[PDB]
Design a protein around this ligand. Structure first.
Ligand SMILES: *Cc1c(COP(=O)(O)O)cnc(C)c1O
Ligand SMILES: *Cc1c(COP(=O)(O)O)cnc(C)c1O
Ligand SMILES: OC[C@H]1O[C@H](O)[C@H](O)[C@@H](O)[C@@H]1O
Ligand SMILES: OC[C@H]1O[C@H](O)[C@H](O)[C@@H](O)[C@@H]1O
Lengths: 831, 831
């Protein structure tokens, strides 16, 4: 018994070894004597991909025969991570491949580490899209992920001298065994041009043509023979005009300029919760909307309609056949674009086309911070997409009339609700477009959904209350438990069975073992084993040593002023300062691991990375501290690293100023993997504590009320500085170079900011946070009672499955029903 | 009996059908109901490539075990054409695949047409390299083709309004089933930088790094189980400095600028026999030399030396293990580069390193016209490659001293021989570098080799006569007979057997059937069948009809003033004019097909294409002419088209001014495919007539003597215009717009040129050429005697095999022996 990673059966280990050898010779064109671990990794990736082309082809032909309502998940990000082990888990192949490669004399685990991550996402939003795709295929939905196939994903972070160095992520350098290019299905996307109003229609004329080429990646559900499709577009120059617009320039130059159109899919924008109004971003945005909508209408034009039905292309049933989800406002151009095709090209009247558009679209909002909001300058939309600016002015014109009629005489409302913002440069507010042209708008945790209805989209909720919904986020139990933490899934599965992997509410049944002494030791034992293995990985891939017997205090997520890595930093310096003061007083030892990426242009986030490494230089070399405290910055945090750190954490840091994190999902990953949370009543932390009970959680701080009371009052940090000696001491340590000796003024920007422009009021939660941290160390010191609380969190985390989330989107926004029904085998077949 | 395209055996047609179906499902991820002809083409290309990975792997391990002298053929061009049928011919797979796909219900021939050509060549030089690679693998040589993997090959030509329109050749748009990327083996190439002279060596410091990534394509020999390798390099940005040279620009821009380094392999230069001194061409040139030489020295450092031998890396045996052939001066930077590594990096003294360099390198010259010669400006070499300019000045310094010592006091010689040319801008003459640093220099036909020794490299021949050699070009009997013309190879094979495919001298034995009446009808019958099939292809892919019963008069090659498409044009207008004069007088009917590509910037060549289409507009629409004369411009001439036209020709036009075409190979292709040649005593036409006897050939014109007598005299075209009424009439037809009605002055440049600056003296051969053409029509009118002459040409064409050429390079330049010895099977094997 290795774990329940499937049967390592006799006819099938022999099958896998035969095919491994076919692909090393025939695919890789290598022989055993010059094959490296990477060639071995590829022979395995190809052998495993062979088991899902069967199911893929019959899942796709199936939706064609039966023709269900189809769900299009449009996102500019998909943060997939590595795909070999996930595919093995979902096909029940993991133990047979483990035995087979072991027989070939190889370590599967060594080979798995060779796979480069698909890092086509920034953080939270992109990873929600990967967890969503997994759950839509597990629930049997005829669902399609649609996005851009970026050839450079999020940069790989290097720390040089304590500073982040960004370098290009050439994830495709060696190939991608999982995608299937589909150049047969390329589609044109148009840019610039102008509009001729001619007799029976506006026409978009004189456009530049970029071609969008598909690449399909299979999305397997968990053990049900459904393999859905993630289609990702590549930009390609036409070979005509990008060459045959003639009369001198140069032939070589005309060919070399082809990579002007192909730059559109070259690199992801590295910004998490921050809007950059660059023209290339808008081009990326129109490009995935333009091409996706052609693929969508094509499938509807076949359906059972391009056969018969009423016979007239009656777009009336388009909403009963199509649901498109907008993942944030990044694909909001899908609303004027679907209006353009229907009015200009299919020739429907405005009001029929508008009824159809709003009934098929729906919008997920992901943040309330204002700098994250997309507000595109009109002179940009004007130049680039002139017909869509006209459709946005007419949507706007008609929406505000509906507002006028309902709130008569309320003239500030009208200017407030406008999709057009006057000012310095006029802008189009993409979030207002999405509520006007969607039938459902949702937030991503119950508090955030309430804050949208009460603050940011209040006027919109008073006008159309029925659109506003909530759908709390989730995580997939398959990568985020079964795959990163097989030890924990075994000891759970020993007691309650394996049906919980697709029914996570069943973890409630673990609550009757909260006093079972074998289970308490087992739960404690795997956390000890994970702590040992990450501690080893650390000296392997990156180190100068840690202590597995300390509390592993970890905060890993994007670096942001609202997620508050500086509040954690202030806490760490307190601990150091107190044991410099009382050296021979025992304290619970901690390894505090802080990791994440800062966007290239966010100078404060880049300075926060420099402060964490500077605290670590001092703390990790004090001889009086010894092993009692280490501070480690976790380099190049990404999906595959999160699969390693989150099993080995004891304490989860979820420290954002109440009202700023819309949900968070890092927090959920840590709850089913046996970590306890210290956190504010923010995002989904509220529903997590409500699920485990506030006594099984360490909440501190200001709630949203208190944040607004303080803002009515006026936040003044000098008051905190004046009343708290310990906090006072830290700041003057920063301000004199204790932490930056050669360069004493280095941290003047963090100090100036914290003292004078702290938007997320870090000092207001400092006392309650160090006092809360005093209570978790007290519980760590009582192992039996830490593990019984941990068992309260694991057992109560199944609400937070993305299968719960997807079944509610499916039921209350998409109008389709989940099915955990196994599709009729893979079995062979050629027709 | 289909033809002798191999056995369509029982266990093997079932084998091929099984594998076709495996790849359509598993590789293509398609099912029979949505698979197009292209998906079918790919299932076949993958099934056939599976039969040569076995042989490839054992051919490569073999040279490793036995370790022979290895031949590196360095060329900036490889004009490969399509590779499926060729591979099928060489593996004896053609009939089994024909039966197998027929059983699957498909037409192999329809699928073969779907393959896009690998057009990584311009014409003559690049196609010689593809014919050379075929013959080196058929003769069992441990040989490597080395070049640039261009992603845009030679442009696809469109005629719009009679004008050439150039468009990009995206030959990889759909994939290439034949290459195998080898990113594991990438190598750095350095650019710009500077030289520090430091204590014990010059060092090239501060360089930009481009990475060269290999892609290997298999080269199968004819039926012998040898599969050699064509390695082709791709340019790739490093992800460090092309990003981590820091302090503002932009992160997105730094990633988008990666395609500055990757532009180096983006597009072939479309110039045939013309030098453009562009910096990107030099970068292309240093890049294939830099990376190839690293791969070469690596293999020598293992050999049996990196095991033992004397034990010291004694580069003395480097010439006994390495031979590199330079295909024209385009890889001449291989001589200062191999000196740089040996002196600077391996630290040999100058004179030992120079002895080794000259003993391993050899240079093929391909043309005597001066504008084709590479003469790179010193300020270019200075900037880009500063260490190599220093090595070229020291090679030069020492070479001219050897010249001084041998020709004492001859000071004009010294300036004449110099690798450095003073003048307006100093330049480095790349051809003089190649003779100074090569042990053999050869030309490509016996006259051209003599003209090199007598005119262009006379000083160099007086100094070192032993270097100058001749190696007349050849064509491969496999694509150029067995593959384009299976009908002709069958009727030959019926009489004399199949050993001639690798022993083409055996075609002499056909001479005893010159009076066999069955053979005369058969030879005539396949030419009739080919004429019928190209005439059909014409209305299929491109037309408004031709007559298969006319003489197919075809001139297909690059458009150039020296290859003289205008002399053919003058001839065509004469024929038209004479039958406008005597309408009811019978003449032998002709379809004259002129095709080829003009380089983008060669305005006269582009105007010659416009004149041929304008003659065709008039001639093809005269009702008095009827079918007696049609003029057709053959669009987008390339390798796969040449495989179609050359079997269907009756008359081969090889009309270049004596002394300008160094060899020609189009002429050889036409001699083994049953076409008669009208031609001047130029290039290899001389050795062809000498092989078939001048009575079996239609030679006309000025010989080289006469060209030089006329140049001593002074060529004056007005004299020709004054004495020949028929030629006079044509010119004034051009000069008044008979051929360009709306735009009468359109052809003033061709007339002005012909009259005043004709470098290739088109009018001097006009009388003798129309008079020679009068005699071929007279023989066409006597079918039995045309076919008996045709049989004199086929039977005597085996000198012109590239296997004869390669066995003489091999013996008299490379020092290795051919072997037609079948390598021990494909048979399976895993070690
Ligand atoms: C889940 C995940 C995130 C989201 O974490 P939060 O705490 O919600 O900000 C970001 N990055 C990675 C690699 C993740 O796996
Ligand atoms: C062989 C070949 C050439 C060379 O023809 P020449 O008559 O020697 O100039 C050029 N183009 C193609 C496509 C060829 O096959
Ligand atoms: O919705 C997925 C994630 O999107 C964004 O990253 C939000 O900041 C985060 O709170 C949320 O959980
Ligand atoms: O050597 C191959 C060919 O190279 C060049 O194209 C020459 O012009 C031609 O005469 C020769 O046959």
């Amino acid at each position: 018994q290795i774990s329940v990673r499937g049967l390592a059966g006799v006819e099938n280990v022999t099958e896998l070894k035969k095919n491994f050898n076919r692909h090393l010779h025939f695919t890789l064109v290598k022989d055993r004597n010059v094959a490296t671990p990477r060639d071995y990794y590829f022979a395995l990736a190809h052998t495993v991909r062979d088991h899902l082309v069967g199911r893929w082809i019959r899942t796709q032909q199936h939706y064609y025969e039966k023709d269900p309502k189809r769900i299009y998940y449009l996102s500019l990000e998909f943060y997939m991570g590595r795909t070999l082990q996930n595919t093995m888990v979902n096909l029940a192949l993991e133990n047979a491949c483990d035995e087979a490669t072991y027989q070939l004399g190889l370590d599967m685990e060594e080979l798995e580490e060779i796979e480069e991550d698909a890092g086509l996402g920034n953080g939270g939003l992109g990873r929600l899209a990967a967890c969503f795709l997994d759950s839509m295929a597990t629930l049997g939905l005829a669902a399609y992920g649609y996005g851009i196939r970026y050839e450079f994903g999020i940069f790989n972070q290097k720390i040089c001298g304590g500073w982040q160095m960004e370098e290009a992520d050439d994830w495709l350098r060696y190939g991608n065994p999982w995608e299937k290019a589909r150049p047969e299905f390329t589609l044109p996307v148009h840019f610039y041009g102008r509009v001729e109003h001619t007799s029976q229609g506006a026409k978009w004329v004189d456009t530049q043509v970029v071609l969008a080429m598909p690449y399909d990646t299979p999305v397997p559900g968990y053990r049900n023979n459904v393999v859905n499709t993630m289609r990702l577009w590549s930009a390609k120059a036409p070979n005509d005009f990008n060459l045959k617009d003639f009369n001198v320039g140069g032939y070589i130059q005309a060919v070399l300029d082809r990579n002007l159109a192909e730059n559109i899919s070259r690199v992801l924008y590295p910004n998490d919760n921050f809007f950059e109004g660059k023209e290339l971003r808008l081009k990326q945005e129109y490009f995935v909307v333009a091409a996706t909508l052609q693929d969508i209408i094509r499938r509807f034009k076949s359906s059972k309609f391009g056969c018969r039905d009423p016979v007239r292309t009656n777009f009336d049933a388009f909403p009963d056949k199509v649901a498109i989800q907008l993942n944030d406002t990044h694909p909001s151009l899908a609303i004027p674009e679907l209006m353009r095709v229907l009015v200009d090209l299919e020739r429907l009247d405005w009001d029929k086309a508008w009824e159809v558009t709003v009934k098929t679209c729906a919008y997920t909002n992901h943040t309330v911070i204002p700098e994250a909001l997309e507000r595109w300058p009109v002179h940009l939309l004007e130049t680039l997409l002139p017909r869509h600016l006209q459709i946005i002015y007419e949507i706007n014109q008609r929406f505000l009339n509906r507002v006028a009629a309902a709130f008569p005489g309320d003239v500030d409302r009208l200017r407030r609700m406008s999709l057009v913002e006057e000012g310095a440069v006029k802008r189009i507010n993409m979030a207002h477009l999405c509520i006007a042209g969607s039938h459902a708008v949702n937030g991503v945790a119950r508090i955030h959904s309430e804050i949208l209805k009460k603050t940011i989209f209040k006027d919109f909720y008073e006008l159309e209350p029925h659109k506003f919904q909530n759908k709390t986020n989730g995580i997939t139990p398959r990568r985020w438990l079964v795959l990163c933490n097989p030890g924990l899934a075994e000891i759970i599965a020993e007691r309650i069975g394996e049906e919980y992997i697709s029914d996570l509410d069943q973890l409630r049944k673990l609550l009757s073992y909260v006093d079972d002494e074998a289970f308490i030791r087992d739960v404690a034992k795997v956390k000890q084993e994970n702590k040992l293995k990450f501690a080893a990985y650390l000296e392997r891939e990156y180190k100068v040593h840690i202590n597995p017997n300390s509390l592993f205090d970890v905060q890993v997520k994007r670096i942001h002023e609202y997620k508050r890595q500086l509040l954690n930093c202030l806490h760490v310096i307190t601990l150091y300062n107190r044991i410099k003061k009382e050296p021979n007083k025992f304290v619970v030892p901690r390894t505090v691991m802080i990791g994440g990426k800062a966007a290239p242009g966010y100078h404060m986030a880049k300075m926060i990375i420099k402060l964490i490494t500077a605290i670590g230089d001092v703390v990790n070399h004090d001889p009086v501290v010894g092993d009692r405290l280490r501070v480690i910055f976790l380099e190049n945090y990404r999906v595959s690293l999160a699969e390693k750190v989150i099993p080995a954490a004891d304490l989860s840091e979820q420290i954002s100023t109440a009202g700023t994190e819309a949900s968070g999902t890092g927090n959920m990953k840590f709850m089913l993997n046996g970590a306890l949370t210290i956190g504010t009543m923010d995002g989904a932390n509220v529903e997590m504590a409500e699920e485990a009970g506030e006594e099984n959680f360490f909440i501190f701080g200001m709630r949203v009320e208190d944040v607004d009371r303080l803002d009515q009052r006026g936040y003044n940090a000098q008051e905190y500085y004046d009343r708290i000696p310990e906090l006072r001491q830290i700041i003057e340590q920063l301000s004199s170079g204790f932490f930056s000796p050669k360069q004493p003024d280095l941290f003047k920007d963090i100090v100036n900011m914290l003292m004078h422009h702290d938007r997320f009021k870090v000092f207001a939660d400092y006392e309650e946070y160090v006092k809360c941290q005093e209570r978790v160390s007290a519980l760590y010191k009582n192992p039996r009672e830490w593990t019984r609380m941990v068992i309260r969190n694991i057992a109560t985390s199944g609400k937070f499955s993305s299968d719960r989330t997807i079944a509610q989107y499916a039921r209350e926004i998409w109008g389709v029903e989940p099915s955990r029904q196994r599709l009729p085998a893979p079995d062979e077949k050629i027709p």
